[PDB]
Amino acid sequence: SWQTYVDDHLLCEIEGNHLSSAAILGQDGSVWAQSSNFPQFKPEEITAIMNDFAEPGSLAPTGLYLGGTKYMVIQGEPGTVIRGKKGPGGVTIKKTNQALIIGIYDEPMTPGQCNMIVEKLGDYLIDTGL
Template sequence: MSWIDEHLMCDIDGTGQHLSAAAIVGHDGSIWAQSSNFPKCQAKEITDGEPGAVIRGKKGSGGVTIKKTAQALVFGIYEEPVTPGQCNLVVERLGDYLAEQGL
């Protein structure tokens, strides 16, 4: 099992549900880890200057949670039946762990 599968694309709380896609991206744009179906994004699609550590977005039945650490951004994308709270939990838990490691 790969690192991304074990920590981001994992079974959420024993429910059998998973995020739709996930990635860990360095502040320099380098891909540290990503699921095979993580969408490609352009530089113009990245928010610049957000003061908080977490960005959340929702569109239709899905959404995204992004957690910023000292060196990376952790992305989680979900669709129903996964809830925003479940996505937040998975992404923020890993982001907090990376932050504790100085990453």
Template sequence: MRLQSYIDEQFRSDADSHFLDPIAIVGHDGTVLAQTFSFPKLKPNEITSIMNEFDNPGSLAATGLHIGETKYT
């Protein structure tokens, strides 16, 4: 199954009017493989900080996770 189809079919189901949005599937190299229309464009520094979190768990605790213009803590 293609990843975009997976997002469209599994996460955007309107059967019960429940869906997740925005969502994306991102590769280990930071490439967005599939996404909903409303998922913001990732900036290079955001990709770097996310990847660094896998190598150094807790590294985002002090700064929070930034995606687009939104900060997540």
């Protein structure tokens, strides 16, 4: 199925762990691919993410929201990666040329394993021009 194809690619294991959910979203807020339990998210959340890629530091004062859940903004990569923390879990968002890769993690996955999955996904996509 398309859903199995997506889950197999986004929820792949890394060091024995896997993302809780993940998506590839267009920079327009559309869905390119979403894993089976990815949250329902709001258009304005994607706008806020895009404006933090354009003007880094803009999201931090008020927090990163995705699916109505608030994350503390922590150090990303200027213009390219946003990271958020909520308890022992969090999120990594990587900008591509036309899209965004989002991975959400929880224990026992580590923040570094989330980063590496999401980062690598995004490099893959960018290398194909997307």
